[PDB]
């Protein structure tokens, strides 16, 4: 699962001059329910 | 969209003018009143 707090979204922040400044920010997590319901198999080089 | 920037820009579409600039006049009001003559040979002559 993906949870996410923060989705995703342009914030325009202050000018204080002669240009326009933009954010992109985001928070995401990453959820599993079991850790063994998924297996990681390493690649190994000879012995 | 992060600290606009538009010097740093790589395929400017010139602002160049469609024509040119010449002011050589070419008035010439004599020559074009006053009438041609042929002539046959290099050289030409008149009484006196």
């Known amino acids: 699962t993906q949870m ?6 342009r914030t325009e922040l202050a000018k204080d001059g002669s240009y326009e400044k933009w954010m992109i920010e985001m928070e995401v997590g990453l959820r599993h ?4 319901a998924s297996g990681v198999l390493f690649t190994a080089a000879g012995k | 969209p992060t600290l606009f920037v538009s010097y740093d820009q790589n395929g400017k579409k010139l602002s160049f003018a469609n024509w040119i600039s010449v002011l050589s006049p070419q008035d010439t009001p004599f020559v074009s009143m006053t009438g041609k003559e042929s002539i046959n040979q290099t050289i030409f002559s008149w009484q006196t």
């Open chain 1, 4 to 9: 996410v707090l923060r989705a995703p979204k």
């Open chain 1, 33 to 36: 329910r079991n850790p063994y």
